[PDB]
Each structure stands twice: as structure tokens, then as C-alpha cells.
Amino acid sequence: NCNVELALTSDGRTIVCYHPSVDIPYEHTKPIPREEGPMIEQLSKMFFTTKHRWYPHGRYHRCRKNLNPPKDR
Amino acid sequence: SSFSRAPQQWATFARIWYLLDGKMQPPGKLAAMASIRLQGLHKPVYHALSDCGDHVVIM
Amino acid sequence: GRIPGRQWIGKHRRPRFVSLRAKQNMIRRLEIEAENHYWLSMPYMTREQERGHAAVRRREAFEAIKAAATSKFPPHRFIADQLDHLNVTKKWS
Amino acid sequence: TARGTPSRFLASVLHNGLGRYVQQLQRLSFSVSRDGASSRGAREFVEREVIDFARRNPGVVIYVNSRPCCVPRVVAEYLNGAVREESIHCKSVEEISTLVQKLADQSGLDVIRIRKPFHTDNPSIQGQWHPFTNKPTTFRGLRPREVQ
Amino acid sequence: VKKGFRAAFRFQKELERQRLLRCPPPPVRRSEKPNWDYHAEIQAFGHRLQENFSLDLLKTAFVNSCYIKSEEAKRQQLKSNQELSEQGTSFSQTCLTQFLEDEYPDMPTEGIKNLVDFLTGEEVVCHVARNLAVEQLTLSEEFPVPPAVLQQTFFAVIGALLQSSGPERTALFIRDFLITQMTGKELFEMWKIINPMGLLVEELKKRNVSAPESRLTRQSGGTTALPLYFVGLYCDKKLIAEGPGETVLVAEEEAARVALRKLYGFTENRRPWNY
Amino acid sequence: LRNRVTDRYFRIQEVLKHARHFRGRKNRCYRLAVRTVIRAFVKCTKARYLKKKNMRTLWINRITAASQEHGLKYPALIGNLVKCQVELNRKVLADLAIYEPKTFKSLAALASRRRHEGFAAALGDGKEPEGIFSRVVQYH
Amino acid sequence: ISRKWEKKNKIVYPPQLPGEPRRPAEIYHCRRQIKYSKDKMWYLAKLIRGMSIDQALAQLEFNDKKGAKIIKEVLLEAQDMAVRDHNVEFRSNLYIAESTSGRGQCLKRIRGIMEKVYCHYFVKLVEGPPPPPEPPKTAVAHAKEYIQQLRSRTIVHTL
RNA sequence: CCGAGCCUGGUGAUAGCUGGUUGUCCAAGAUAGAAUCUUAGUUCAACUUUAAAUUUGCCCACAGAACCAAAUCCCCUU
């Protein structure tokens, strides 16, 4: 997919790109219709990940955790 | 643009489902295309620590 | 599937083969070499004309070398340095 | 190293360059020693070059004292509150003038590692990429293998 | 017992510094912290912001009313702040409304009132006050200085500037120190609304355009716990917005927020302020 | 013991303050720490060349993703942009792929147009007019 | 040799004002030089680190350990002086907040160098019902925490 | 613990042999050879380092170096 209008100036010195937002038409839209082992396995199958994500980590890793991290943007 | 910060973050990083038809194809070309799409290298967002994968259904 | 002693030294070595990269690299270097031969192919002077055209410059450079080697001597010693060392115990009035 | 150190993102203070450049320093607190060869240099700086510095920037008030708490020093206090304490034990007047100009030029933010050398807060103007920028729409919005 | 003093004294000062971090000192005012001189530091405040205040007006802007009461209470064993604070508040509200009208003409008066309230709110004027160091030069009841008193003091400073050197320079002050506080933020975290689809519906009734339809433009993962939905808001075969959400209701209401931003012109792309 | 050492505590703490976030008697005991704080400062001083290399392959991965999403490959995109004389680097092109995709869409389209224009001149090599974006700017 | 536990008992707070929730009374006690090792007494101390004082006294009457007898003695001592001195109005309204044990000044003899051991026992009691055991986290908690992390992730190493 | 006790002294025995030799920083710096009861060492040399006097130094074509191949000396010049 690529749909733009490219051009040069007369001098051949700068390029001009022209490229507006194509919108989604009305027709292209649908309308709105209106135990620990089992525990970790059903989490894994609910979130499409594996069980080592859900097994805990000790006090030592949780203490190396940062709790007040910097925030940007 | 002009979405709120958390809805924009969600839509940027969400998980997308790809159907790939295996009739007559070679398993290695199938594997190449699905391997890229599973690591999330088909996203300009990609990084290894961002868990930016996507789902692939090979039928 | 092994290589007997060390991989690259000795009687039986692991085979190594030439690829498209190695051939193409060798060939671009050989084409630079051919152009080197061509541009050394055409001298301007020969020995009889070049003999003596840089006597002034070579002897000038050697007088510079000789003078900078012979002018090697300890620096001067002043008074203001020694008295600036007395300026360490300076106090405001 | 960089992991044995707190880090921060690149910051303004109060969007300091937008409307006007607000000199991010309030105070210098000098302390020089009267009878001291350790503070001979800071003495020479207060003698020679602090008048023109105070004249050069009127935003900062410069107090000097004699006989500090322990050692001759400068304590700059910046606008965002952070108080920097640099030590001019046994420095020349030249080094003291460069250290002071650095303080008066710097903003009060830390010298810890800065994560990114650029801080746009409105990065995208044509909208940040998401998986549905350029996947083309369909007729009645059907997904693949739709019966209808 | 090893002979010597430098190392024993180095250790003693190190223990003192560890103590100063373990039990940090109780926060007490910079005005009685050493190396202080009020008149010079008033003049430093003026030359730092680079316009001339009349010094008596600036001082009486800093001195509060509660401080006067407590100072009489201390004295039993001055012109206050309040007139300057009223003038500063009146002028700051009026020219903030003026600046935001001239830059955002389509925004409704309720929205622009919420913008002015955000810019003159407690938290923003507390931060601009503290990071401008009026929090040191003010005289109040206790340290730390309470945020209401900080807001009142800062607007009093603006009032002293207004009486001192004119509405143009005072408007430059308000602009360069309060509108920079909205550069970077969004409309709907500056004007907190509820039922944004409702706000869209009534505002389109004002515009005499039909009430919009919601459509489900794009989606993924419709039957798991990580869906994506773009719900678009359309009106008469064309759209005014499209927005994301983790479910259809959130996506629709966030697309309503996107529509309201685009209708008021307060998007992310808008022509940045002309400083 | 006419003069022996009294400041050894502070030298020890110069190593241990960088060791404090280690794991084990590396963070406590000084021999173990010295050996492993040296290795950490060396790891830093090589990780700077590493960080430059790693960034630039991240940029190649991101530009590759976006240009394959527009129908190019990364070799085609960089090669034909340098032929059309836009001297953008990978860092800016990667940020343009993520943050500014309409501009990247135009860049991919221009790279395709330059590829096919330059190769039209290649197919008709010999006396032909110079290509439209194959016009170059040469400095006297 | 350092006795800050007993001095911790004698730390005295300033008076309260009527608009404050009621401060729970804190009682520290220590038994020095038990002829028993620090880590057997650690097993008993970890056994009673959270129990209401009457249940703790039950477990410690019917354990089988020399430490169990010595700990029951210490806890009865601390309860007695808590309702006698530190103004704990209800005798049973105490719970064991810290129960620890540390090592003492051990003595030596030749067997090989045999070290006849000695340990300490420390206990702090607090007014009030014991704290509930925080529930072991469930599927709603895990799903919410995963989704919070996935909403927290950003586009790393660019603007 | 006797192919010749144990102790104290001479005794800080002698070790061409192993091991060990503690602050920061910067800079120059690599493997002809000879003789030796000598090849687990050393003395000279060659190389290396600092400081000094100077004045030529390294490379290269041509001419040139013996009768019974690759190359190397050599030096006006550059």
C-alpha cells in the first residue's frame, strides 16, 4: 500500500510530498452488536503465554524491583 | 492521532491475528512468514523487550 | 564429524572454500591494481632530469634538523618564580 | 556504572526556554578562609573576579563569609530547590572562575544519567503507528473466512 | 590504637552525613536558614524575571494576612496581601480567557472556563510558585507554605506587576508562566468531563447535524481478554472520528472524546502557541 | 608499628559502594567485590561500542518492518533514497517509521519511483534523457 | 554485647490528641544466654511469629523442644509485665509481632574444637487482634496485574 | 617419625630451586650470537631506556662484486 502524490519544484532542488488522510467509508464498517496448578494453567490459556510468567518471585527480586520509576511523555 | 494516552498505547501495542493457508506451500516459507509475524518484526514498533508479538494461525 | 589436531594448523586442516564474496573482493582489488600499474606507467622526468632539482630543499630540511638538534639546552631560571613560591603564606590584612 | 546509578529523563525545569529564559540559580554561598593557604585561591577570586560576576548576572545573590563550618566552599542554591555544594579547597583563581561560571550556567537538575537526549512531548503529528494504519478495509468489514 | 586525626575525623563527618539522611532534618524556612538577606533577594527576584516591580508593592504582595495576625500574636508578649491578590486574580482570569478565546475560538465557554480553572488551579500554581521561588520569599504561618496561600501569593505578585508596569507586560507574564503549563497536556485531562457521547450529542444538536451513528470500523481478538476495537463515529455516510478501546463501549466513548477534540479544534496537531 | 594505615576503611568503601547491588559475598566481602567491580567497569567501557552497534541494528529492524509493510525491502529503500539524494539516516528514518507514518509512506513511494525511473534509464541505456528524479545536484 | 532491645522497651512517646486513632501498645522482651542453639530456636521463633498469644502458648506447651519450654516462660513473663506495666488492659489482647532469635557468647572446649552454644530470644508483643493472613493472590489479581503491565509498556529506544 | 637421637647454639645456615613482592597516572619497549663441570644459570654482545654531542642517517636505479634460481651488498640522487 502506497497512495501519494509526489512532485519536484521547477528548479529540481526540493521534493514535495502530498499525502492526506484517507478515511474509512460508511460502507466498510460493521455495526455494533449489543488449586494453584489449574489456576496458572487457566491464566496461561487465557493470556496465550506460559506458566513461568505467573509463578512468583521471591522477596529478593521483588526488592530489587524499582517502585518509583521515571516517567516520560 | 488525538487519542488519549492509554487508548493510544493500547492500540499501538495490541495483538493481531493472521491466517496463513498451508496448501501446497513449503513448510519453510510458511515458517519464515510466521516466524517474523510471531516475533513482531512486522511492526515498526519492534523491540525484544516490548513483548510485541502477534498471533498466527496456519491452517 | 571432527578435525584432528587443531582446525587450521597442521597436516590435515578443516577445508575452507572460496565464495562469491572472496572472489569479488579479490577482483575489485585486482582492478585497483591494474589502474595502479597504468598510472605508474608514465614517468615525467627521468633520472638525468631529476638529478639535483631538490638540493636546496633537502639541505634546508637538514639544516632545520641539525639546528633543532643542536639547540638543546636547559631553560632559564628567573626570580619571580621563587618569590611566587613565597606567595603561598599570603593572608588578608 | 549506569546500573549502579539512578537515571532520569531529559527535563526542562519550568519549560524554561519557552517564553523567557529564567536564570535557574538563586544563591551562591561562598566561604573563604582568612588565614589559610588552602583557601588562598578562593581568596584571590573574591579579591579579583567576584565583582564583575555579580555585575554580570543580577539574578543571583552572592553571600561570602569567613571561617566556614569546616572547609572553604561554594553552595549554590538553584531555582528548583536543589542545593549543590562544590568544594574549592586548594584551587587556583582560574579554576574557581570556571567552576563558578559552570554553576551559574547549569540548571539545578541532577548529573545522573539521562536516558534520552531528546524530549518531544508531542512526538507524532500524523499519528503514531498502530497495526491498523495501512491494513486495507473491506466490504461490510468482513474478516477472512467469513461466511457472510 | 592507631595514631592520627585525619581519618578519625573523616569517619566522624561520614557518620554525621549518614545521620542526616537516616533522620532528615525537619523542614524549616529558608528565611531563617543562614545566608539570607531579604532586600537583596527581592531585587534578585525582580531581575531574575527581568521586569521591574515597584519594591514596596512587591513586598506588600508577599506579606499575607494570617502572617500579620500571627505577628501581632507574637508581638503581644502593615498592609496585607488581599487587595493585590484580588486584582491579580481578576486580571489573570480575564486575560487567560482572552488568550484562550483568541487561540481557540470554537471552544465553548464552559470548556474555556475549565481551561482557566485548570491554569489557575491549586496544583499548577503551587508548582509554578515553588519552582519560581515565591515559596521562599513569602511570609506565612508554617513551613511548608500551604498551597492556597501560595496561589494567593502568586496572584498577588501578578497584581503588583499589573499595578507596576502595565497590562501588556502583565499579560506576557501570565502567558509565559501559565500557558506553558498547558503545553504538553490534553483537553480532557485539563477539562474533566463525563458522558462524552452525551456532550457530543448536544453539541451536534447545536450544530443542527443529525445525531451520529457508531460503527465498528476495525477489530481484533473479539473473543479473548485482549481485544482491540476501533469504533468510528459517523454522521450521514461520513465520519467525524475513530477511536480505540479494549471493548466496544470504551472505544465508542473514546472516539466521542476524539470527535469532541476535533470539533473544538483542540487536537494534537494544533498550531502550537506563538510565544 | 611506627606508621601504619588508618584510612583503609575509606579505600574499602570506594570499592564496596559500587559493589552494593551485586549478589552474594560479592556485595559484602572485599576480595570478591574488587574482582567483580573491575569486571563491571570493563563491561561498561566495552558496552559503549556495543550500544552503538545495537542501536543501528534496531534501526535496521524497524525500517525493514515499515518498508516491507509498504512493499519495499530495506536494501531497495536505502539504496534508492541515496540515489535520489535524500541524506536521511537510520535513526530519523526509524523514528519516521514509528512516529510519522505518512511521511514514511511517501518516502517508500519515492524510493519505488526512483527505482523504476533509474531502471527505465538502465533499460534504455545509451542516448536517453536523464531521469526525472535521476537529475542530480553537483557542486562546483 | 548490646542491649538495645530492652532499651527499645523504654522508649516513651509524646502524648496523643483526641482526634487520632489509638496507638497499639508495644512490649519488648529478651532472654539472654539460653543453652540452646540459635537456629533450633529459629525454628520455634518462626513457628510463633504471627500467632495470637494464647494460641502461641498452646503450640508451645505441646511442642517437644527445650526451646519451647524456654519460650513459653518468656511469653508468660512478657504478658505479666505487659498487663502490669505497659498498660495493656486485656491480658489476651496481645499478639507476637516479632519473635526472633540470635546467637550469644559461645564457649569452647577440646573434643577438634567443640563450641558449646548459647542463643538469645527476642519477642515483641502488640495490643490488638493478630493481623489477618493476606490472601494468596487469585486469578482476578493476576489478570489485572498482567494487563496493567501490558498497558504500561512503551516504545523503547526511540522518542 | 633412627641408612645414625634430641635439644640449644654457629644460624636471619646455603639455596642457579618453587612460592611471594602492597598507591594513582602516562610514556618508550620483544625472542642475532659467544664462552662456560655450561644449556633450570651467568659474563660479553645484539636489542631496550633515559640524558648529552652532533652530522649525516635509512631506502633505491645505473656503473660495479669468479673461475670452478628467488634474491643480497653498494651508493650519486630522490
UniProtKB/Swiss-Prot annotation, chain A:
Subcellular location: Mitochondrion
Protein's GO biological process: mitochondrial translation; translation
SS bond list: none
Broad class of where this protein is predominantly found: mitochondrion
UniProt keywords, alphabetically: Mitochondrion, Ribonucleoprotein, Ribosomal protein, Transit peptide
Coiled coil: none
GO molecular function (one): RNA binding
A GO cellular-component term linked to this record: plasma membrane
Keyword Ribonucleoprotein tagged: yes
Keyword Ribonucleoprotein listed: yes
Family: Belongs to the mitochondrion-specific ribosomal protein mL42 family.
Subunit-structure text: Component of the mitochondrial large ribosomal subunit (mt-LSU). Mature mammalian 55S mitochondrial ribosomes consist of a small (28S) and a large (39S) subunit. The 28S small subunit contains a 12S ribosomal RNA (12S mt-rRNA) and 30 different proteins. The 39S large subunit contains a 16S rRNA (16S mt-rRNA), a copy of mitochondrial valine transfer RNA (mt-tRNA(Val)), which plays an integral structural role, and 52 different proteins.
Name of the featured protein: Large ribosomal subunit protein mL42
Species assigned in the record: Homo sapiens (Human)
Swiss-Prot record, chain B:
Localisation per UniProt entry: Mitochondrion
Residue positions, PTM N-acetylserine: S1
Homology family: Belongs to the universal ribosomal protein uL13 family.
UniProt subunit comment: Component of the mitochondrial large ribosomal subunit (mt-LSU). Mature mammalian 55S mitochondrial ribosomes consist of a small (28S) and a large (39S) subunit. The 28S small subunit contains a 12S ribosomal RNA (12S mt-rRNA) and 30 different proteins. The 39S large subunit contains a 16S rRNA (16S mt-rRNA), a copy of mitochondrial valine transfer RNA (mt-tRNA(Val)), which plays an integral structural role, and 52 different proteins. Interacts with OXA1L.
Name of the protein in its database record: Large ribosomal subunit protein uL13m
Organism: Homo sapiens (Human)
Parent-protein start and end of this portion: 2 to 60 of 178
From Swiss-Prot, chain D:
Molecular functions (GO terms): RNA binding; structural constituent of ribosome
Cellular component, GO, one term: mitochondrion
Keyword Repeat on entry: no
Keyword Ribonucleoprotein: yes
UniProt keyword list: Mitochondrion, Ribonucleoprotein, Ribosomal protein, Transit peptide
Biological process, per Gene Ontology: mitochondrial translation; translation
Tissue: High relative levels in skeletal muscle and testis. Lower levels of expression in the heart, brain, placenta, lung, liver, kidney, pancreas, spleen, thymus, prostate, ovary, small intestine, colon and leukocytes. Expression is coregulated with TWNK.
Disulfide bridges in this chain: none
Cellular localization per UniProt: Mitochondrion
Major subcellular site: mitochondrion
Family: Belongs to the mitochondrion-specific ribosomal protein mL43 family.
Quaternary context: Component of the mitochondrial large ribosomal subunit (mt-LSU). Mature mammalian 55S mitochondrial ribosomes consist of a small (28S) and a large (39S) subunit. The 28S small subunit contains a 12S ribosomal RNA (12S mt-rRNA) and 30 different proteins. The 39S large subunit contains a 16S rRNA (16S mt-rRNA), a copy of mitochondrial valine transfer RNA (mt-tRNA(Val)), which plays an integral structural role, and 52 different proteins.
Protein name per the record: Large ribosomal subunit protein mL43
Gene source species: Homo sapiens
Lineage: Eukaryota, Metazoa, Chordata, Craniata, Vertebrata
Full-length numbering of the shown residues: 2 to 149 of 215
From Swiss-Prot, chain F:
Annotated family: Belongs to the bacterial ribosomal protein bL20 family.
Gene3D superfamilies (UniProt xref): Ribosomal protein L20
Keyword Ribonucleoprotein assigned: yes
Broad class of where this protein is predominantly found: mitochondrion
UniProt-annotated location(s): Mitochondrion
Keywords assigned: Mitochondrion, Ribonucleoprotein, Ribosomal protein, Transit peptide
Gene: MRPL20
Cited NCBIfam families: rplT_bact
Phylogenetic classification of the source organism: Eukaryota, Metazoa, Chordata, Craniata, Vertebrata
Coiled coil ranges: none
Protein name: Large ribosomal subunit protein bL20m
CDD domains attached to this UniProt entry: Ribosomal_L20 (cd07026)
GO MF assignments: RNA binding; rRNA binding; structural constituent of ribosome
InterPro entries referenced in this protein's UniProt entry, alphabetically: Ribosomal_bL20, Ribosomal_protein_bL20_C
Native organism: Homo sapiens (Human)
Listed SUPFAM superfamilies: Ribosomal protein L20
Gene Ontology biological process terms, A to Z: mitochondrial translation
Subunit details: Component of the mitochondrial large ribosomal subunit (mt-LSU). Mature mammalian 55S mitochondrial ribosomes consist of a small (28S) and a large (39S) subunit. The 28S small subunit contains a 12S ribosomal RNA (12S mt-rRNA) and 30 different proteins. The 39S large subunit contains a 16S rRNA (16S mt-rRNA), a copy of mitochondrial valine transfer RNA (mt-tRNA(Val)), which plays an integral structural role, and 52 different proteins. Interacts with OXA1L.
GO cellular component, one term: mitochondrion
